[PDB]
Design a protein around this ligand. Structure first.
Ligand SMILES: [Ca+2]
Ligand SMILES: [Ca+2]
Ligand SMILES: [Ca+2]
Ligand SMILES: [Ca+2]
Ligand SMILES: [Ca+2]
Ligand SMILES: [Ca+2]
Ligand SMILES: [Ca+2]
Ligand SMILES: [Ca+2]
Ligand SMILES: [Ca+2]
Ligand SMILES: [Ca+2]
Ligand SMILES: [Cl-]
Ligand SMILES: [Cl-]
Ligand SMILES: [Cl-]
Ligand SMILES: [Cl-]
Lengths: 190, 190
């Protein structure tokens, strides 16, 4: 097997917790238990990555200097793991199925950065293009955290994900950044 | 005095913790103690907002139904407050001045979303424009979390913030989203 680097593990942890928090808010906004389940699965991945980070750090360091440095990484991962647990706490509320105060969904839809649901029509120019080819985060500011395609979810889609008419994109971004993408998705803006 | 709504307090909490985490990573990337100090000040604001949220929730609810609903809000704020404490943990490492493992700065610069430093030249078209007039988050995907102007910091600048040549923008976004803004900032792209 090809060994992983500390940086690769660390980057995945950071990237994953960010996605986790976004998905946690999405689960609350949509009262969606499947999204909530995904958050919990990611919390487990975070525990696994944290374990590997500790293993790598323990094995890599043999003297005091090296030790002091790997400890800084473990300390940061520790804080990251706390954020993952908080996202999991939010997800659990959705799985418990509690009736949320109406202000909650409004809050997620009206803050600086919001979560939006975008319907893709056949006439849109993004149909048939991949997220990478598109680089939506780069070119629209809207970051796609998930896609609902029929009876299935694609969480954290990669650059190879090709968009189809009928897809429902779950994006994170500013309000005007979400409405802009909706225009493009409706084919209004070519 | 004009009373605040639960939603206003809640939105500020959510917005603030997001900014806190971004600033925490910025403090680590730049080994900047002033940014770290700002994170700690925001952790205190979060404690204050949490207090006001509890006050509003306690006063607003008088019967079981209303109580069950305000509790959902308090439960979410509880998780948000945990995230704020994690950001504060990261900031403290910078204030302690520990020597960070080199992988840390690399990780912040190479993940899905990174933190970038952008120099604004006199010839750039963004000079003299406000963040609102510009709506950078909306129009570039790059979210401006802070600006270093001479010997002073402006954290979480509002829509009225007018950009000047010599400003150093601290942005959050994708790599290609950061390089794009740098082009605009250098005047290369009008
Ligand atoms: Ca854990
Ligand atoms: Ca060892
Ligand atoms: Ca802990
Ligand atoms: Ca299914
Ligand atoms: Ca569909
Ligand atoms: Ca606190
Ligand atoms: Ca009461
Ligand atoms: Ca706690
Ligand atoms: Ca100063
Ligand atoms: Ca300057
Ligand atoms: Cl690597
Ligand atoms: Cl299609
Ligand atoms: Cl309001
Ligand atoms: Cl100027």
């Amino acid at each position: 097997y090809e060994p992983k680097s500390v940086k690769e593990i660390f980057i995945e942890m950071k990237d994953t917790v960010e996605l986790m928090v976004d998905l946690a808010y999405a689960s609350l906004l949509f009262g969606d238990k499947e999204i909530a389940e995904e958050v919990l699965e990611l919390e487990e991945r975070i525990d696994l990555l944290n374990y590997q980070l500790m293993m790598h750090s323990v094995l890599a360091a043999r003297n005091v200097k090296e030790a002091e440095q790997v400890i800084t990484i473990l300390q940061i991962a520790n804080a990251i793991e706390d954020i993952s647990n908080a996202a999991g706490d939010l997800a659990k509320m959705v799985l418990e199925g509690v009736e949320l105060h109406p202000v909650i969904k409004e809050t997620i839809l009206e803050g600086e950065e919001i979560i939006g649901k975008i319907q893709v029509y056949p006439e849109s120019v993004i149909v048939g293009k991949t997220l990478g080819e598109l680089d939506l985060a780069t070119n629209t500011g809207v970051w796609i955290i998930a896609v609902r395609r029929g009876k299935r979810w694609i969480f954290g889609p990669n650059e190879n994900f090709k968009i189809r008419a009928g897809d429902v994109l779950i994006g994170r971004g500013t309000r005007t950044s979400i409405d802009h993408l909706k225009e493009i998705a409706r084919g209004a803006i070519r």
